Design a protein around this ligand. Structure first.
Ligand SMILES: Nc1nc2c(ncn2[C@@H]2O[C@H](COP(=O)(O)OP(=O)(O)OP(=O)(O)O)[C@@H](O)[C@H]2O)c(=O)[nH]1
Ligand SMILES: [Mg+2]
Length: 172
């Protein structure tokens, strides 16, 4: 006797934000349980896979697209965004200018990507490096929620991803 296979959801998720805010470190902590203090800049886009045992009958596979910080100044984001179901937009709490870039990334995303029915994709805001007004910002810029995160100390990355996936499931 075999047990029945689990239902599966496969989601391509974007991780965007300006240089050095911690996008790659968030993904590396989430998927590989690892962190590095050395800064190695992403070139173009890198990828990582997260398998989530969502509930006893369900598996969620996340294809994470780790986009480099300078790409909002290029012309590749529309290609990079294609077929994504959700995104994290990231800034660095220690460098407030990176918060000002959050709206630029959000407008870039919303102008180049929408769900098949025309609804904008689910987006969660990550205030990263928290180891070192937000509600109003999320309501005014169309975010489903926000979290203080730390790739170094592993704070709220699991929680923020679960929040994003919950919203994606609810809007399919
Ligand atoms: N203290 C602290 N440092 C962090 C955290 N996350 C990332 N860093 C550091 O911030 C620097 C930049 O991290 P990256 O993950 O490479 O940032 P990025 O957004 O991927 O940068 P680009 O790929 O160039 O756009 C690295 O030195 C990391 O060690 C964090 O949560 N806390
Ligand atoms: Mg990177």
């Amino acid at each position: 006797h075999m047990q029945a296979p689990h239902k599966e959801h496969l989601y391509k998720l974007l991780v965007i934000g300006d240089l050095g805010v911690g996008k790659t470190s968030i993904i590396k902590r989430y998927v590989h349980q690892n962190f590095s203090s050395h800064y190695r800049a992403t070139i173009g886009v890198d990828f990582a896979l997260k398998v989530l045992h969502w509930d006893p009958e369900t598996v969620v596979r996340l294809q994470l697209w780790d986009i480099a910080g300078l790409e909002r100044f290029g012309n590749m984001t529309r290609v990079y965004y294609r077929e994504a179901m959700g995104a994290f937009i990231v800034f660095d709490v220690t460098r407030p200018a990176t918060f000002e870039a959050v709206a630029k990334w959000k407008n870039d995303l919303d102008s180049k990507l929408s769900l098949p029915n025309g609804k904008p994709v689910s987006v969660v805001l990550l205030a990263n490096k928290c180891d070192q007004k937000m509600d109003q910002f999320c309501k005014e810029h169309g975010f489903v929620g926000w979290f203080e995160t730390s790739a170094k100390e592993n704070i709220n990355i699991d929680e923020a991803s679960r929040c994003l996936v919950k919203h994606i499931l609810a809007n399919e």
